[model samples]
Target chain A: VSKRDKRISLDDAVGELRSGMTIGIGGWGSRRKPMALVRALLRSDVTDLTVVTYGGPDLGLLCSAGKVTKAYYGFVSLDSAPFYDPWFAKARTAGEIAVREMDEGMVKCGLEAAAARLPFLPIRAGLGSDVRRFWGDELRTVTSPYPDASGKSETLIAMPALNLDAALVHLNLGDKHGNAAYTGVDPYFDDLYCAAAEKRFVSVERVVETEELVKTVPLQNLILNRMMVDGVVEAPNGAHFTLAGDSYGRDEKFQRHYAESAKTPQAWQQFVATYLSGSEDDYQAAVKKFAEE
Target chain B: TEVTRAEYCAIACADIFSGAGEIMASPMATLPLIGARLARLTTEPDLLITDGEALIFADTPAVGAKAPIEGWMPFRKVFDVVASGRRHVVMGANQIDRHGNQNLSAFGPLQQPTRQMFGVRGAPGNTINHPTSYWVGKHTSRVFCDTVDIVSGVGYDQIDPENPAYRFHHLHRVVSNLGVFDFGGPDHTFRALSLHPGVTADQVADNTSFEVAGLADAGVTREPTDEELRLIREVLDPRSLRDREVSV
Candidate 1:
């Protein structure tokens, strides 16, 4: 049997998502985020999302658009000067979005547990940190079955599975069959995000033939296989404003402007009118115009 | 020769890894990053340094310069190293308590923090797994707190002697703008190891919210050696980025 074609439009891929669904966004801070898919969700009427991410602008944008009711994240950073995301901070301070802040490692552990179809995974992280208080009664500790050298069992933080209704990721290249590769320095756990979710959608910088995927990068860079992906979209500059490996670096100037725009209602309104009120094509065109000026 | 406070801070930071031989030296900020590289160049030649990205450096490159790649160390691999207890990370602290518990997460409540910062990114894992020190650019009562709003890094007071899971927890020296500190006091309470030159003991006491042990007996932080000074000034920090992190 031939491989199934999983190619879909950005809107169609996001159309599968519903309100109040737990969504895992794949990327490290300000890097390789699925911006096109995030923008699609922004354009859609979806609200009350439970966003799980190693967050950056994707989380900020969602929170700013009033789409997120709750969030689970290790951190929300711009990964440059002015490190924190302004909108995320505003959302947290204003009590707009509920948060489950955790250790960076715990985020990975949670995803791993979900991907493995386990209820929870025991980890050394969050043992003595405020993560305990952040999670409150929702999280628990598990005693190890085996004793240590002194015949005493260790108590580890039992990181619960971060179950995702949908997982969204962006890679540099993908095939129509849904096999994807990230040509960047780090894969950033896109595969784990896909594995942990019921429905997984990937947006790629370019969709090549199946053979061309191997030709462009090493086989190791092929992070997502056909089985893990349900939908794929070929959107050029899909991870715009976030680093997409060698495809493009983060739009630092635009990012700084995005941060500055959050300082006041007037600036934010103008920014929304110029960028957020438009289609992806219009957004890209505005960015181009921004660059020229 | 007179050493600038930034240079002195760099030296103090390098001293954190004095005997740390042949292990991954992960320094999170500019001064500590310079210090780790300085250590590799001078006293601790066996210390391994990374480009702060994915590549390990075969040879020490100056700050912001490209070096020859030794091996790939992705975030996944770095986590493995953290668990292996073979790494020493010098991270920044937004707030730190008497017991050496550091916080960089947020301020006020957990659910709705009044001010949100970077979450507990690797501090819990780092503090529980390996030698984790902190670099505090500004040492004030707000930062050197009576009680940290959140505990991102596990301190001696928080560790359970009964739990073997916390076996590798080591909160090493905290090199700040004013001085060097450690959890070396009675019951592992915060203590001043040294005060930077021209900074008085009273100044340290005034700045810190809690009483620091061994304050009266604390010595001045040692100046960088001639070779270390040369390396820091001429080699490691040609751009003077360390000054940006620590004034004077």
Candidate 2:
């Protein structure tokens, strides 16, 4: 008998998560993050996660909840709020979170390597600066078997893989088989993160038929092929408050409100209790209320 | 000629693009966006720019309007360009030092940082990959510190000991509200190339946390020419959005 469809629920998908497992989260800052899945994980009592992300409120939300023990990132911020991430700032200052900072390219390349199942990728990044000086564990210099312009052997830094136990990504549309497409301007290395993980879970704005999926956009816009995705969930407004292709733009007012409320622990707690403490349906209703006002 | 901070800074930023021989301009800051557009509209017409999204634009568009898509530059292709040193990215720095090492990542200890910035983004890759320039909307000792809290972007002084390959590329220029600076001074330290009109060299030094080198004979920053100003004011930035970024 053939296998069944790969569609799953947020709770069932997140149930596979375990402690001490590295996870990769997708999207640029305040862009198309897998927020619904993120919210489901937040509701769970999972702890001590080492996350790899492009760094958005996903990291902020995860770090704010004290769920993340370590973060490997290139930059984290509410891009709409631009130049402010009070939650991430407080988390870093709280001194409880360990971080491994890399150049944006390195973060992408590491995932690319992991997805390709390569041991390490040779890179010219982080050669001369403080990143090399500080994050030596992640970088190693090797003799370039070839000679240089001056007829001498050259040395280069080889960046290691950022393999994840699981990866969470959100898309504008996907089929039950897990084929995903992005209508937004940039995919921001979402596919690479999925490829780098042992298991990949995808959340989409909507689920369509396979025929409809292929006709939606260009083949190049198709980020996740069905083969790479283990399970898929259909969650409308999955990337809420974050931009999700042609579906909707980022909710700027709420993002600003999110930044504003994070000013105090009590306010942040109240903000979370008001929005995140309840079901995703409740959160959507609150967002609707905020928009109406 | 009297020039506002927006005009002078845009013109100064245009100079960075002008000197950047055959490079792709990928700027994250607003003023740099205007400057890159100004460069594309003015002298450096061949200059390439990404719409800060995915597509590459052949013509300059206003802040909100969409430009003509010349080509598509996926994140993968962008790094391929970075590997080739054909890209010139202008980024904002949270803190920079005399040697050009920039900090966009965090402040204080790594484990428990006192403050977290943008997490270094592409600062390290851009710095070591190609000719990178920095744009500071505000120039103060706090922004331009003695030493950066973290070395997110590699600078000249930091390059000497580690790897010689990185020496192939270095900081191109630094445009701030006060004036223009470069690393062409003694040992790649910071030097005042020019000061804005009505702003004295001592005032520039006083605001700088570190001792700025080679200010004794710095020139006055050149104001935008009539054609450049018209392009900046009319074509590139119709709303005078650049002015709101900084005013002097």
Candidate 3:
């Protein structure tokens, strides 16, 4: 279907996630990752899922809620800086999630593998020995001049390009066709992602009727066609607590606060209740109460 | 008329000092933090402090700040804008490139997953070319790894001995809550120069992912004087904004 009347329920949208399923969220530090949906997912019944993200607020909240069973990646929450303790580091150090660490390259290739429709892609990202074991002999099984190619005698690491059951992503704008666009300094791997997933859920900050996505700024990286995206969502300030870039105030307090609190689930839950809870059914009231310094 | 000397001690960079040097001030942002973190953990009292002219970032008006300011500035964004030939910007991160490049991007692959902060801001200019110094909020193997996933920011060593397309980018000190470090002479491999009062070389060495140069006889940093702390607290912040105290 090319259109829909409403977005998926927080619980219903996330309820489908089962144990060990991988998820990837966007943003750095507190820039543009979806903290609102994440906060919603936190209260939902989803748990034991292999939660993945740029690891700022989304990761922080999930880890704290005991929702993250395994986390994959290299960087988390560079935005939660000043307010800086991230949930991933805390959970890993405290023995919470599996904390399977892979940097940006592997993460990108994983999404790319799915996008390219290959069973898996081999890569040379194991130089430092951080996330190599997680991929193991099954996924990573060869060496090549090109990290993704095989048939040569070289030690190839075959990563079964992930075919996600679904994908949930945030965007700056979208058209009637379900084409999504974003504007900013970095495209990240979002373009490579939505195309790769079996079902894609796109969240838009602002809806537009224009046929073409804006070309003004650093024009939105990749425009996701409606045919590919299973559902289109309209959400505002969706990437809060995480990096929303031009949107919400960076919760700068968390860094110093995180430094003091436990990166543990117990401490993280307190952080959510204390800070991330309650919304703005009314924007003014929400800002006055929630946005009040 | 505005002439002032080290009410305590003064620090400077290429813009003010010949190189990255410490100084005294009323109170500062990152430095006080560095100082305070050091004080909180150390046993022996630190003394050779500075109080003269500190250039703390944030809402403070220590010496410099964002141009058209009515409120507090984003520490990283503010520093990113000011990351020029004569200035230095310090950032905190999980992994830094061998040449000192760093990434502030995704945690996992983009697709059906959890997060969305997409790219590196203007770090390359700040760290590689003009900046005088950099500091990690935390110093661990995660923060001090071998290769950076993305080149969100740039470092001097990016150019090849074979290719001369890229020019020199100067970065000085890399201070962390753990200790102080220097880019080893011509190599640019981050090396231990000093341990904050109580931290040991072993502690620093054990935590970093890559092999760091040794600092067997490392000393404590120049303790920021009382004058520096006061200026940072009283004059800089209050005048900068009324929402005075630290965040919740």
Candidate 4:
């Protein structure tokens, strides 16, 4: 009998990324981003990529690092800090990263289309805003083949699929086999990121046995099933500096440190050296010390 | 005898939602949230108010009071309503241009912002898909700019009558400490519809970053009606939250 392991090292998982590929990072703003994978990716030679996210440190860090060539999303916000991502702002101002903004709904539907392997999905979002004007070709209006509430042909925005080369998501709990659950107010399109990508990876705070996971969470709470995942990495404090829902709160003081540090290249390098560029053990120890004080 | 200026602005913002008529009022900022609830409890009963989560309330739950869900609006269904043009959102921006381009994303240049703000989260879609409105606690030259650094939400300049997307591109209301405004002109440009009590056309123009259409024929803004003032004071914001945001 042969045994297959779905678990991979954080560095090994990030190694799959290539330059200029569109990648999706899941979790709502300043919440539950797979920062372990993000930190690992930052340490590597990956650059000039198109990154999609709900706008958090993932967008800010990548934008500041000049690794991102393009971005597609609703906005980039740090809810905990309650400001636009400064790093992302600096990059955008420098014209280093191109942006293709979408309404929250268009982003959701585009991913839904990708997940279903469809060319596009007809949605009602981005209908009458500059969202359509800017992305008019992507969001063409298709008249209703059927009658509307008033028996009139209603026009709708046909949302094009937002395909991704890969997706990285973090969860509260997962099994070594790759099934995960979100013990929070919402799953927040984490599963959609998985379904939308050509390949998907999940990092969890902890991995319990398969039976333990099912027993702990209800069937509905299990947002992602094992079938869609390619790899899992055990990354305790993985959603660091970001809220991990009921599991833990966001580390704001540290997030502020990064936010302030990224302002200067020298400061950013010092920040990377102290926290991001190190091995996970060193990063964990640094956080433990930071949190303690 | 006189209602506070914040209360007056609340009534004005509430007036915007009165016409929303059976639509979801997803007010993200303070003044609009108060206005949405006031409208729901008073004039617009069918107005859908969410828990800022997944559920719509059956009653006007207090500021922080937890109430059971009257209806479900989970992750996917939110878009279902928004896409149908059944939702109205009151968003805030750091800067707004003469052309009505709203910017919450950045305050300086496209790449090197002097100040960074909330990015173009849902503004582009909100402005295009449904009737959107704006509320600013402070109305000043810095906010009403000549050209915003980035277009978080589409303004009048991007509108093409030939395009169906622009067909629904309506900026319903622009409520500030100074006055109430609307994009009601024949050219669909922003015009000062009325001034809040005591604010003059000169005061408005002086503070504005660009040359506005100036005051309409009836320059005075109507004070909050007796009933509207009562609701704002007693029922909706009993704690005087609105006053903290804007004072006249």
Candidate 5:
């Protein structure tokens, strides 16, 4: 009969996070975003978390809220707007964010590291004298496959892997059994992220009965069982609101909120209050209550 | 010895292009990965021609097949042959279930649904009859979880007799950041065949998501014969790993 003991709620899961944990997220810049969860995290008690994601509304909101201590990404977005990503260039100089330079593809490597459950990923190289100082013990690379003068194969390239603490993914649907699916999802890049994390979590639109899902939905659609997921939260329009969509473009109001919130310390407090607070459960309820047709 | 790079590259490898067989190329950004993939494929095809091979068409006198253009684009085209139940392209996975299902969807940890990255692009064709390879850049104990959050691709299992992957995936090879792993029988439950240099099975098992079938004492992968390694190191990564020229 009790709510807390029954199933893991979004508030409970987001509340467990702390100020200095490395967080990996699932979703592209705009498409299939997790807006509700971002709102929840914003409203939660967590702050100063080191954020890692390829860039999108998730990173934009966190940066705009100023909850990021260290942020890393290849590109903030391909979309027209730019304020959602507050820490890429200008913030790096002022020390608002401690950014470690990484090219693209490293996202896949980092996610893989989490799935592989490795403490640290070995990397080949980076650039600059300043970048090298931070690189002292951070990256340990090994010589990889290459060729020698006589045209023989030799493994001699410095290559390193990427590792992460946790990976968070969003899905289109899930059954009570925890079997999930993504109707028009990306190329399952998050699988590597989840596989490469200490803890992997998933949120679905609805957790239906298995027999019905199997009958109505296309077979071989997507199936995430109970065990792989540590927790499950049902969030509607979560991805669209937070991550944005390739077809729909980012929500202008949200982008304005980011610009204003990231501009001053005062706005950040308000942003956090409205988003991440004691438990995201209240925030979710508020967002739901506010949806007016 | 005096032959051009194209000539030398073609000496034994020309059959891939000249022999006239079906070829499936990947996006251009992954040229280095594509080259390595093409090298692995060259032996299987009557002739393996890369889009990079087209550069050799003009300069037959100056230098030979050694140029990055030995595998040119003019001869390249997408594989339009529907599922003939013959060839299969290996891919990566976010999760593979007990019944051998796969996932490459997005992040939410099963508790909080946010955004999904995208859906399974090629699983249906791969699972119907074509052999599919699930390549993971990294392998760890955690990766072999009780269940995957998403099933982008499928893999087989040992005791799970009714696993569906066996019914479709004729051959599923798991190539990882560490080494090459294969599945048992036709079922596709993974077993380690070899490790990349300096890799041990114990170390590999430490990072994998699923329990590899015959892991404890996995055999060391024979260094690809000199010719094979050449295909990987020389023609494959001649320029750079990220911007390789094998596939244009």
Candidate 6:
């Protein structure tokens, strides 16, 4: 049957990942991140990830855990007060990770190229900026096949495709058959991430019957159809600390605490022991404890 | 005669979008937000403004107040608009060189920056695709250096005149707490357009790392018109949030 149940667990989804695989994470900076998957990856033996993202705490958490060896990003922002990610700052300053940093538009362009199975896409961005230096000789320029009114062909930056082994995304609701919807104002290219990757895994705030997906949100809000998704994990509060549309706003108090903890090694260690060094249920329970106190 | 420096800076910022017609006016911070809204309400009535998220504002709401929605512009559509050259953005600069090369990526080295801020978010695309100005609430030698650690935004010296890809590149203005500037000097070098009231040429020179042109000939920045001041005080920013950015 085409409607085969595609429901999966966090562990099983992350189990499919391998070391050194390029993983494209779906979400904007500090918003709607698949934190359950990220935390699951944190507990796994996988290392040396080449992480791609608009970047938020997902990049920061991965960097802090020493799981990433290379990163491709437009920026790593908490999108709040003390906007920078401290662990990412630490990794950059210490030369711990290789980077492929470019214009935000270029990241999307690269993803679009990969989604379309093209080698590269020509764009006006990064033509005169140091993005060339960042990409080294791997970045190329292509001359337009056609000429303008002056009969001169224009050369532009050919943004390379960002092909990925896996893509991890979090949506507000999904069905057993893997159709998903995001109730947020912005979809933030979750569909593009799924299209650009070989294996697509999604986690949602709740799992419903197949027909319930269309009833909960506008038809256009159904960002991921069953054909695009491989596995769907029901993980409530799955995008904790990050915004998950109308489900909840970002946990700003917790985010501030996370930022403040990164100021010192001892503090970070304590933070990890309290919040991160446990199972997902434990982490949620610890967060609940944190809220009450 | 009671014009605050913050109000002067707001007026200067608003002037950045004076003739920007019916295009998206993107401002990165609160002062420029005030400026863009001021311009939209007064001079550039046709300019489009956003809620700094996904919605286009049907009416200019006061700073931090909710506005009526006109249209949706998610990050995807915004990128499309950026590439189409239908937008003018005023962005912040952590480090800026004399030729207008901006740095907000990192500092020290390329591979391993001694310090890192936000990576080149939209600066690269913004500079090459449309009219981009800069806002620096604080003016100092470190922020206005001779050479930036990294070039997030392209400048006049960096552009190859022979290349048509760079045809849309426009570094419009640099609005600072101290003065207003443009790349209008000899050979497209940085030049002073005006100095804020009570700010002398020597003060700007002392804080800058390199030579500036048109200093002696520069005029005092115009005070916000009486009507504009009324809008600033009574409408756009009743709480005087602009004061937190620049002192009197």
DockQ top scorer: 6
After superposition, which runs of candidate 2 have C-alpha atoms over 4 Å from their true positions? A1-3, B161-164
Q: List the residue pairs that clash in candidate 2.
A: none
Clash counts for all predictions: 0, 0, 69, 12, 98, 0
What is candidate 2's lDDT per residue for A201-276, written digit by digit as tens? 9999889987899998889888888788999999898898788878889988888888888888898888888889
lDDT of 5 by residue, A227-281 (tens): 5566677765556454422223445555555555666778877766665565445
For candidate 5 chain B, the 10 contiguous residues with the lowest summed lDDT are: B74-83
- The sequence of per-residue lDDT tens digits that candidate 5 reaches over residues B59-178 is 111112342334333211111221344344554566554345555543333212233333233343344445555554445554556676544444443112332222334444555556
lDDT by residue for model 1 (A184-287), tens: 68998899999999999999999999899989899799999998999999989888888888899988999899999999999999998998887788888998
Give me the overall lDDT of model 1: 0.91
lDDT (Cα) of model 5: 0.48
Model 1 pairs in collision: none
Q: Which ten residues in a row have the lowest lDDT in candidate 4 chain B?
A: B159-168
Candidate 3 residue lDDT tens string, B1-248: 12111211122111122223332111124443333223322321221122211122322233333322232222222322332243334444546754565665434432221332433333433443344355454567777777765455555565433221123355556666566677763477777766655567787778787677766767754554555445534544334331221111
Query: Between candidates 1 and 5, which one is better according to DockQ?
Result: 1
DockQ of each: 0.82, 0.67, 0.04, 0.39, 0.02, 0.90
For candidate 4, the TM-score is 0.88
lDDT of each: 0.91, 0.84, 0.50, 0.80, 0.48, 0.92
Reference-based TM-score of each model:
0.98, 0.95, 0.53, 0.88, 0.47, 0.99
CAPRI-style docking class of model 4 based on DockQ: acceptable
All models, RMSD in angstroms: 1.2, 2.0, 11.8, 3.3, 19.4, 1.0
Candidate 3 matches the true fold with a TM-score of 0.53
Instruction: Give a tens-digit lDDT track for model 2, residues B80-194.
Output: 8888889888989989998898888778876777777777777878888888999998889998888888888888875644445665677889999888999988888898999
Task: Give the interface RMSD of each candidate.
Answer: 1.0, 2.0, 12.5, 3.7, 19.3, 0.6
How good is the docking of model 6, as DockQ? 0.90
